Amino acid sequence: EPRVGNKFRLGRKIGSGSFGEIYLGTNIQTNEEVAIKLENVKTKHPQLLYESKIYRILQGGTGIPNVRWFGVEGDYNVLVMDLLGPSLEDLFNFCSRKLSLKTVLMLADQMINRVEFVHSKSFLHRDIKPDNFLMGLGRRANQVYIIDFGLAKKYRDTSTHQHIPYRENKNLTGTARYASVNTHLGIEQSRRDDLESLGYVLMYFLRGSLPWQGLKAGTKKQKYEKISEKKVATSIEALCRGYPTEFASYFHYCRSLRFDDKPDYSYLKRLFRDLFIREGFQFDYVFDWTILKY
Numbered sequence: 304e305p306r307v308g309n310k311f312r313l314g315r316k317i318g319s320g321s322f323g324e325i326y327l328g329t330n331i332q333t334n335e336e337v338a339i340k341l342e343n344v345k346t347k348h349p350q351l352l353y354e355s356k357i358y359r360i361l362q363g364g365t366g367i368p369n370v371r372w373f374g375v376e377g378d379y380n381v382l383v384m385d386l387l388g389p390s391l392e393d394l395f396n397f398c399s400r401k402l403s404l405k406t407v408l409m410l411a412d413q414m415i416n417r418v419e420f421v422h423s424k425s426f427l428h429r430d431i432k433p434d435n436f437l438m439g440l441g442r443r444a445n446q447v448y449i450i451d452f453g454l455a456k457k458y459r460d461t462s463t464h465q466h467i468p469y470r471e472n473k474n475l476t477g478t479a480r481y482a483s484v485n486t487h488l489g490i491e492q493s494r495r496d497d498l499e500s501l502g503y504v505l506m507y508f509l510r511g512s513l514p515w516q517g518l519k520a521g522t523k524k525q526k527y528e529k530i531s532e533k534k535v536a537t538s539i540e541a542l543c544r545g546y547p548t549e550f551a552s553y554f555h556y557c558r559s560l561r562f563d564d565k566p567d568y569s570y571l572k573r574l575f576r577d578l579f580i581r582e583g584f585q586f587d588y589v590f591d592w593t594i595l596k597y
Contacts, residue, residue: 306331307381308372313339321453322350328383330371337371340382344375350453351380357426357452358384364420366413366439366448387448388440391508392433398591401511404547406591408579411505412572413447418501419568421449422494425461429454429492431500432481433507445588458493466563467491479530480516481507487531495560498571502553509546549574 305313311328318325328339342351355373362369372383421428430451439446454476459466470491477486481503483496507513515533520526543551552574560566
């Protein structure tokens with residue numbers, strides 16, 4: 304019936320996203336199931352072709368899914384890629400919207416690795432949020448993947464490591480709930496902003512909410528300004544109060560980074576790894592959702 308290229312068949316609409324729609328496809332020769340993403344060639348912000356190129360650059364990294372096929376067919380850009388499992392936001396919901404410290408530290412170790420990897424290939428991700436991390440399937444069920452390079456941008460020359468220049472009057476571009484303060488302020492994002500967003504992601508899991516959720520306003524642009532203000536008004540102490548000191552030190556370190564500094568990812572990982580050991584947890588890969596399903 305409906306085929307993409309002459310190699311995949313399209314099926315169940317397993318969801319969508321900013322670009323457009325997601326379908327469950329099958330390779331015709333092998334019968335392997337794959338994800339098919341379709342984007343109207345008319346859209347205002349096309350991202351599928353750009354992603355196909357970024358995923359080629361990132362290919363082979365741990366937790367980077369593979370692209371199987373890209374092309375324009377009729378009125379759509381079509382991106383076919385590995386099928387993955389539930390997103391961390393999906394699993395956070397399954398887990399009653401609060402995750403154990405043990406789960407948060409097993410996640411942090413992988414997520415910091417995924418960020419360092421993307422940055423090692425000279426890109427910023429720039430939309431770090433729970434929906435953009437997915438668990439793998441079957442045997443890779445314990446591995447965290449990073450997806451959606453639609454907002455990605457190169458921060459340095461891949462040859463010279465000359466960093467992009469500083470800039471200040473930008474439009475706001477993340478997801479407001481996880482965006483860095485500098486992002487709200489219209490400052491050019493760099494490596495430190497990806498790490499500060501990941502810190503918010505981790506505190507959202509650990510605390511169950513962030514203190515700038517559920518703010519009331521009249522329109523998005525007003526709600527966005529309320530969100531920046533509350534972020535600025537929430538001290539690191541207040542955000543991390545009653546949680547291990549390691550999380551405050553994570554934010555202190557992010558705040559210490561200048562625009563072009565290369566982060567010490569080892570240092571951040573070490574904080575959480577030493578905490579994990581000191582708590583006596585076993586590093587098995589038994590996340591809250593893993594224990595819950597059995």
